[model samples]
Target: SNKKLIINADDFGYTPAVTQGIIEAHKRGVVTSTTALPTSPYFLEAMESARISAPTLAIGVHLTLTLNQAKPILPREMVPSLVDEAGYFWHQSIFEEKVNLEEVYNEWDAQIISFMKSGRRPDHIDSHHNVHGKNKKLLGVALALARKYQLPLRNASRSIETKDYLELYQDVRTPDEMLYQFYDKAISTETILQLLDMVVCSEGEVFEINCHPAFIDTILQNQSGYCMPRIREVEILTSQEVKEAIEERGILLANYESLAM
Candidate 1:
């Protein structure tokens, strides 16, 4: 059995420290790709860091609609419903039924444009927290962006077995499978190795393993409350032992571009 793996470090542009750690993971570890939030205050640092250190790391837009490390691309005046009077986004998406779909399309379209004009041709599309995947209308916005940008999209999937394989939209390129079990209590080196041990790809099967490896800093600590696990991840993803584990398994490291149909 042949296994093709994609080590995608998500949230690359959250902060300078966070981007610093992601760059290290790419240079020293198995990270072949990264997805970043253009909405973050430090996207330029993230962009510049990759160009200097990890030139080959595939860049993808981590389309963000939930968190507020920064504000929306379209002026808050234009997409008034999306933000409060202070212009920051509300944090939860589960119970919010008032998210205007037209506003979503407008902001996402503007976001892709912003990332492109910043000069990094985005390689793929996936949302922050799989925010689009959990909802129907938002997935439509993601699909529209993928079609217009001509980029691959992550499956609207998750850590669960059944949901992780659903393509959700026809004709949009996506990974055959995705892995998200590396978070929370499963966030450990042994857990990473065990995940590698269980992977087996058939033919051209592309499987993506998503991880968040970042340097701990005030900005990161202030935003997600998911501080220590990220610090632990950088060490785990960069250590030589983890690289050896993947090589020992003969897992072929692939990219999002390789999965395009």
Candidate 2:
């Protein structure tokens, strides 16, 4: 009766500083999975280090429709409904409501392909802010891709926490419960482990906890709203006590691979 916990670290290659953060977390043995953003300018360089060092860390695509000021793998013209007039993906709020399902389908597919091109076999599919879970139409695109690729998908509702997620595809896989509403209050190891204490009792039931652990840098400091908390999260996640608690409790720390099969 072991508990399988997927500590799926979100946003793997957003910046070089961020990539360093996940690698440290992975080495600490608490983070078994991380999802990469394909459009991140630093991703390939980040991927090289991950390949060199984080051998046990399962890599997956952080399937993206929006980026800070970046372009997509596909030309903006190809995914017109997904981008603004300037061709960056609309902000999450804008894209959440206005994203054309077909265009999203295409761009997300391209991002997944780009991740594969970076020499990783994508372990699962999730989103930046769990944007796909916005509406049934938006979610169906991810479901379709998951079915097509024979991969697992995240529960997709992280902007809010809901375990009663839509099970749209017959074959697509997601964790039984995605415990992702970890607000600022949940940032410390004390709160993180406190939340873990309540949920680790199930026998073979999988839980996915969303963690966006990263280091802050000039790029992050200048443009990101969710910056400093990530650094704090990295510190807490890498703390010795956090790893020892999970080990002592016999919780099986694993990656999305645990759910995929």
Candidate 3:
């Protein structure tokens, strides 16, 4: 049996710049899904545009907690801890410094309801910066919200060391620290092959392989506040070599709506 992979572009509505990149990734690359932020400046417009252009695209809620922008769809007074002075959710990379479990749950619940009310029920749920999986309190809150809403969650099982990855990364730099705990330490073509296989053999009916694929625009470079390794991720993810590798292993690329149907 073939297992499907969902290649999602997170931060769907973060900005006109981000929206443009996501559209390009879907139209020209392997991207099949995305997560929209209710707090993003282009939220409403992104929703309307996505409905038509990427008709089969699986939509999800991209939960915002703290640093970049800070506003709440809910009354600002209700979730005070989750926002900044201008009133959008701050996009902070350091989750430990900002989130409280109760507050996260409260705001996430509101965000979910707001998303559904927009007439687009999310196909799944994920966080802005893999933050959901990184912070224990935040993860617990996010997962509870998922369970309460009966939505599936994306699990990134990067437990492979493929030679191809090393070959590809011959000129690349590895991160100083692991962003999340689940990432496995092995780098090779065989390792990636094994990881993809594991996902196929995984027990869950719904799984998400979160990836960021863009053309490495200047706007994107600056958006991460500092240059995130998004460019490196882009190189490997968009490479034809990697695609062939996954497909050869019988892993079918899939998105949320595709899985739901």
Best by TM-score: 2
- Would you give me the overall lDDT of model 1? 0.79
TM-score of structure candidate 2: 0.93
1 against 3, candidate with superior lDDT: 1
User: What's the residue-level lDDT of 93 in candidate 1?
Assistant: 54
TM-score of 1: 0.91
RMSD of each: 2.2, 2.0, 8.9
Candidate 2 structure quality by residue, lDDT tens digits, 133-232: 8777778889988888889888765544442455474577777667775657568777777757856755437778878888777876765678888878
Clashing pairs in 2: none
CA displacement after TM-score superposition, residue 196 of candidate 2 (Å): 1.2
Model 1 stretches with alpha carbons more than 4 Å out: 93-95, 159-167, 201-204
Residue 209 C-alpha lDDT in model 1:
89
Query: Among all windows of ten consecutive residues in candidate 3, which has the lowest summed lDDT?
Result: 170-179
Models 1 onward score TM values of 0.91, 0.93, 0.70
Residue-level error in angstroms, candidate 1, position 219:
1.5
CA lDDT, every model vs. true structure: 0.79, 0.79, 0.61
